[PDB]
Design a protein around this ligand. Structure first.
Ligand SMILES: *[C@@H]1O[C@H](CO)[C@@H](O[C@@H]2O[C@H](CO)[C@@H](O)[C@H](O)[C@H]2NC(C)=O)[C@H](O)[C@H]1NC(C)=O
Ligand SMILES: *[C@@H]1O[C@H](CO)[C@@H](O)[C@H](O)[C@H]1NC(C)=O
Ligand SMILES: *[C@@H]1O[C@H](CO)[C@@H](O)[C@H](O)[C@H]1NC(C)=O
Ligand SMILES: *[C@@H]1O[C@H](CO)[C@@H](O)[C@H](O)[C@H]1NC(C)=O
Ligand SMILES: *[C@@H]1O[C@H](CO)[C@@H](O)[C@H](O)[C@H]1NC(C)=O
Ligand SMILES: [Mg+2]
Lengths: 180, 196
């Protein structure tokens, strides 16, 4: 089964530079693990605006994820995630960018879940959406609810939270507030 | 330019690990959506119709630029701030001297001052007794650079037997109204002898 897969990655100011680098490394690792014929990839950064950093044709030409992501610069602006998701649905899964019409569409959305816009992602209904949570701001109730809103259902299976090594900091913070 | 957002203070200097209140405001008549996009942890919020104040805490990066925004009709109005951190010279370390140094040969003095900065505000000095041997300002280093090293070659003399070498780090934030922070290494004794 052919699968067109798009990484939709959060380049907003709420993510630390070290976290953004981890997002980039995550994309590279996933690509290396799926470096077969059947999967082809595209990556789109989003913050205030959206940038297709590479498309399916780029993937096929270069293959090397280090090559494909070398021009990425961290946008460091807002987090228009609903807009981004709608952009991918309508503008990135296209034959013009090398998308295959026969292929199963998948979106891997990597974000702290703190969207600064709103709306619906109905245009993305028929795309399989996996959500990858990262960052201190993913830990709020509203962010967790947002991540689940974006995920395909059952969200339990499609939502994953990357451990970036700061869980003890989140614990101290919470305990300091309740215990004093 | 008729409607705007503003973030106050727009530029702030905080001690590394410290906190800061920011106030994001607008003259938009009926703002629809408002916020402050930053990687910094928050620890307090207050809001009014046209403003949002947030306390940001555990501020550790050399530099960060929060983005304040309000949606106003069809436009997002935004203002961008700058939070810089400073780090005192809590660690000033002179590298060990040779157990015994031949008179008339060179040895290396190296002062290391990890993490302190901004680096452009640091001056490091190497001393023999109370005499300053080498003084180096790091003026002109990049604004986000932290830490400093000062290394110098010194010719060993008979006179320097039993003399104490040390170094001093100064972080001069007085141009920014924040004070002069100094620290010195523990002294190291030179022991010299003639190889003849
Ligand atoms: C943050 O800023 C605003 C405006 O600079 C503060 O003051 C109020 O602003 C509104 C308009 O947004 C004015 O109509 C009022 O006159 C202001 N009220 C007061 C009491 O001065 C607001 O109080 C600030 N908030 C914090 C927490 O400092
Ligand atoms: C966090 O907020 C509490 C009150 O809600 C306050 O007492 C405390 O000072 C804040 N933390 C910091 C680091 O200032
Ligand atoms: C000097 O060093 C000590 C640690 O050795 C530190 O606690 C203190 O804050 C330092 N003083 C200044 C002004 O940097
Ligand atoms: C010691 O260092 C100085 C400065 O580099 C050099 O000019 C001189 O030749 C050296 N002297 C000896 C004894 O090696
Ligand atoms: C160097 O320091 C030691 C103690 O730290 C002191 O006793 C000694 O007098 C000093 N050497 C001199 C006199 O230059
Ligand atoms: Mg964000």
């Amino acid at each position: 089964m052919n699968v067109d897969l798009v990484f939709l990655f959060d380049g907003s100011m709420s993510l630390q530079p070290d976290e953004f680098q981890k997002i980039l490394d995550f994309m590279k690792d996933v690509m290396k693990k799926l470096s077969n014929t059947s999967y082809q990839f595209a990556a789109v950064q989003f913050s205030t605006s959206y940038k297709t950093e590479f498309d399916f044709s780029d993937y096929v030409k270069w293959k090397d994820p280090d090559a494909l992501l070398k021009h990425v610069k961290h946008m460091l602006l807002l987090t228009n995630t609903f807009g981004a998701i709608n952009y991918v649905a309508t503008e990135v899964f296209r034959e013009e960018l090398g998308a295959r019409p026969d292929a199963t569409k998948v979106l891997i959305i990597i974000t702290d879940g703190e969207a600064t816009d709103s709306g619906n992602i109905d245009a993305a209904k028929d795309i399989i959406r996996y959500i990858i949570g990262i960052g201190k701001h993913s830990q709020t109730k509203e962010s967790q609810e947002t991540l689940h809103k974006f995920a395909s259902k059952p969200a339990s299976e499609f939502v994953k939270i990357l451990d970036t090594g700061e869980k003890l900091k989140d614990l101290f913070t919470e305990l300091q507030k309740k215990i004093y | 330019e008729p409607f705007w957002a503003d973030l106050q203070p727009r530029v702030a200097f905080v001690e590394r690990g410290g906190s800061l209140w920011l106030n994001c405001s607008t003259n938009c008549p009926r703002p629809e959506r408002g916020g402050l996009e930053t990687s910094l942890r928050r620890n307090g919020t207050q809001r009014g119709l046209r403003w949002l104040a947030r306390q940001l805490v555990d501020i550790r990066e050399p530099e960060t630029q929060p983005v304040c925004f309000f949606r106003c009709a069809r436009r997002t109005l935004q203002a961008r701030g700058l939070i810089r951190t400073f780090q005192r010279p809590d660690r000033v370390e002179l590298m060990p001297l040779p157990p015994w140094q031949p008179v008339g040969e060179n040895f290396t003095l190296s002062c290391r001052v990890p993490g302190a900065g901004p680096r452009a505000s640091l001056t490091l000095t190497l001393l023999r007794g109370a005499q300053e041997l080498i003084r180096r300002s790091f003026a002109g280093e990049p604004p986000r650079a932290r830490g400093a090293v000062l290394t110098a070659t010194v010719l060993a003399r008979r006179e320097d037997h039993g003399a104490n070498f040390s170094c001093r780090a100064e972080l001069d934030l007085r141009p920014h109204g924040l004070g002069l922070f100094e620290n010195s290494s523990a002294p190291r004794e030179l022991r010299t002898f003639s190889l003849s």
